[PDB]
Design a protein around this ligand. Sequence first.
Ligand code: HEM
Ligand code: HEM
Ligand SMILES: Cc1cc(N)nc(C[C@@H]2CNC[C@H]2NCCNCCc2cccc(F)c2)c1
Ligand SMILES: Cc1cc(N)nc(C[C@@H]2CNC[C@H]2NCCNCCc2cccc(F)c2)c1
Ligand SMILES: C[C@H](O)[C@H](O)[C@H]1CNc2nc(N)[nH]c(=O)c2N1
Ligand SMILES: C[C@H](O)[C@H](O)[C@H]1CNc2nc(N)[nH]c(=O)c2N1
Ligand SMILES: [Zn+2]
Lengths: 411, 407
Amino acid sequence: RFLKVKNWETDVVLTDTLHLKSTLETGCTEHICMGSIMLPVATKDQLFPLAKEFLDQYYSSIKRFGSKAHMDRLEEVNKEIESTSTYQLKDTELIYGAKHAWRNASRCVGRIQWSKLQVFDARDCTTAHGMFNYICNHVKYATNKGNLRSAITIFPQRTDGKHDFRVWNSQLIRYAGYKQPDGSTLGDPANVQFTEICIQQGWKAPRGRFDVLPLLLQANGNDPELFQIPPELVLEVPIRHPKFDWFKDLGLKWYGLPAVSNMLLEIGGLEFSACPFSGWYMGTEIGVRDYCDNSRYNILEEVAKKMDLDMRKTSSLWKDQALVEINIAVLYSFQSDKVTIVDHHSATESFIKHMENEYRCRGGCPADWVWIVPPMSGSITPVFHQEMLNYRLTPSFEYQPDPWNTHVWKG
Amino acid sequence: RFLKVKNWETDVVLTDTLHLKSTLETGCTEHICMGSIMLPTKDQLFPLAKEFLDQYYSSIKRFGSKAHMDRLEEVNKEIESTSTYQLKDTELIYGAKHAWRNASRCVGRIQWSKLQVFDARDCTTAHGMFNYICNHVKYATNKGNLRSAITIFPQRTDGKHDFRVWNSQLIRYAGYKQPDGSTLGDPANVQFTEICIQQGWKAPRGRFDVLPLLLQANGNDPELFQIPPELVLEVPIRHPKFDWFKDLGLKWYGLPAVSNMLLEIGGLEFSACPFSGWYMGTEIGVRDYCDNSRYNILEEVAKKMDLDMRKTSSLWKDQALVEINIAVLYSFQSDKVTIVDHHSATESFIKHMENEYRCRGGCPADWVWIVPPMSGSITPVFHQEMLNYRLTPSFEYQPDPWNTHVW
Ligand code: HEM
Ligand code: HEM
Ligand SMILES: Cc1cc(N)nc(C[C@@H]2CNC[C@H]2NCCNCCc2cccc(F)c2)c1
Ligand SMILES: Cc1cc(N)nc(C[C@@H]2CNC[C@H]2NCCNCCc2cccc(F)c2)c1
Ligand SMILES: C[C@H](O)[C@H](O)[C@H]1CNc2nc(N)[nH]c(=O)c2N1
Ligand SMILES: C[C@H](O)[C@H](O)[C@H]1CNc2nc(N)[nH]c(=O)c2N1
Ligand SMILES: [Zn+2]
């Protein structure tokens, strides 16, 4: 099975064989496409084959497939599984695994960068305090005074499922949201429920529009504990506009480091339930989604007012007009303060080069068009015109349920 | 079995059961999603007819009635003898409206039940086809108060007697390759334009030359025809703020009319079925004008706007895109030619989905196509999960006739 994809703008045709290595399921069937659905304890029996596939992959990557070193590793892992019901990854295998999970992440437009990932091994961590320290170091290293570097920190793997390490925050750095009695929200509405848990856990909320949330960290299946990230470690960028001097008075700012902390990293059947990773922002993530989603900060109207746009009819495209201005402002503000950011034109152009390279050297590149195409100006980016194939490879990042939903409170 | 779709902006959850009546295949498997791929006998005919008649008779609340059973026998008989059958007018109108209703890539379906169906099954020649098409064009255009319409020519027989419109749309602009190396007019229609010239068309060789119609009746070689200019409503493009905009020389036609698809009703294949509605503004302002491989006017517009074109991060492309799209909507509106903006079309489609979920148990929808090519996430459809599946009657793609036709 060889599958072709075409770019309808350049006529470039690519051939995918990599999808043949794909094990897991998509959610689609021969009779239904679920391509726009957001979300469509392992035994000894299942664990050794997962480890074997992984180690075969790894040993092939280093060009030592079938070597004594390969065979001895397989037998040692097999022996460890029979003896302990699980196994430990070598450092080299862990690094390879984390890099490949990113490389395999079909929703990620930033994958050109996949092989430059700083991996921090935190598998010796035992406590929430220890977690807090590892996370501070990650943020400092990743931030690098505005010259952002990709990084991931990997806490100990799942054992019986009763001893999970979890970061309860969905991102390492995010702003509080507060629901007022009149039904309005102060700060980020996406984080209301989590903000409430923090407060209940004893967090003293400043109750402003951009309060950096505390970290809520769970080690070894224990109840999570609160920690405040040192503010000097949180790089933030005040948002202003190069031509509109009133833009600064909206009082907007955002943080520089996007750091996902709620996903599960699977490598060779092992499950790393706390594996916060970070890169740098594409401008639209902030300027389109965080600022302009109706369910988020929702600033379109206010910006449109200040621009004196005709707001009587949608057909004036006043929303579209303000949207662009806001995104100009985000990019200009990050650049002026020398904080790494990428615009959607540049990021998508790089992704196309990446994808073409991946087909040539790897036999394919799994990609989720729904997610890769930016949330503004879709068709003026080269990805809009690129056919893509979505399929699931491991190592992988996976979603997991929010821990407040599953956690057994001890007290 | 039962499937949920959620809207992440409103938290409204809908349940889909209509997918369980899906016959055709998606291109996807359990192992691979092809959601972004653009193009993924006697015995055969009877279950198809029955499947169709059963849904028809259930639609008019006569499922299992004598009229139902009697029609199933009458069709079984005609199939057993002729190897095809003929739709009643009522069935043909129902099948057409439902093919639109079932078009998962169409954002404009709130309108599906107000389709005017022109039965051209009595047509025998290209001149006859030309007459039907002029009438369709004039009826649909309605002096700028556009009305949806489809004209349906005779159904396929042996497949050597096909009626085809060779144009992809009834109305489109010519594309010519130049000594310069660049392209004059619409580059999407370069190959079709050459075939017209090859067939004998005298090209005016301008930027916006309405293509002639190239019509094929009963499997014969196709013939050229100029649509009467007075029947082609065009809109000059100007900007409500920018005086200089008019001087780019831009115009577009008011009537969007797909003529290359195949309409399938109860196993019967209608290879010539031009249909038309009215434009969503972005189809012209984003795609026709700004695609790199289309009129590609972004560089010129950004220049007139004196934007900073040195870095992509000034979002000069995005600023100019918006102004172009404002101009398109302003112009059509000023000329009272029906047009819808992407905000209003997508809001209506969300209302339509909800209607369809409560009334029919679902609405097949292709998110990749429904979400507009600009400002995606500020439209409600962006945040709406959709399930895509294939119901019949339907519109389907077919080979371009020139790659097929035996001369
Ligand atoms: C380095 C610059 C990076 C850029 C510009 C980038 C960009 C993006 C964007 C725009 C998305 C779509 C998510 C959304 O819009 O909500 C995304 C998703 C994702 N990215 Fe990347 N990313 C980068 C680094 C990374 C790194 C370092 C990793 C892991 C090592 C990663 C893994 C993922 C994953 C797993 C998703 C899916 C998130 C989800 O499904 O919710 N990304 N990325
Ligand atoms: C009344 C106003 C209408 C609006 C605003 C509208 C809107 C649209 C849009 C935006 C598309 C995507 C096309 C593209 O980007 O190239 C589309 C596709 C489509 N439409 Fe509608 N439409 C309308 C009427 C109709 C009618 C009357 C029919 C049939 C009777 C129809 C059938 C289809 C089909 C079959 C497609 C997919 C065709 C393809 O894949 O190119 N539409 N429509
Ligand atoms: C590392 C990195 C760099 C970067 N520039 N950008 C990112 C995107 C983050 C990660 N993940 C989405 C973005 N964060 C937004 C939060 N949304 C969660 C996605 C979601 C919601 C609901 C259901 C579901 F299935 C998925 C990461
Ligand atoms: C009836 C109607 C009304 C309306 N507003 N809008 C429409 C969409 C038209 C028809 N169909 C596309 C749109 N016209 C744009 C031309 N593009 C051709 C699409 C295409 C190109 C290459 C390969 C392929 F598979 C498909 C129809
Ligand atoms: C319903 C739909 O699948 C959902 O809104 C998706 C669409 N595409 C996306 N793309 C990105 N990058 N991020 C998102 O959150 C979403 N949301
Ligand atoms: C490759 C990709 O499927 C292709 O560019 C599609 C994407 N979505 C689209 N959506 C619409 N409405 N029209 C199109 O032509 C396309 N093109
Ligand atoms: Zn699919």
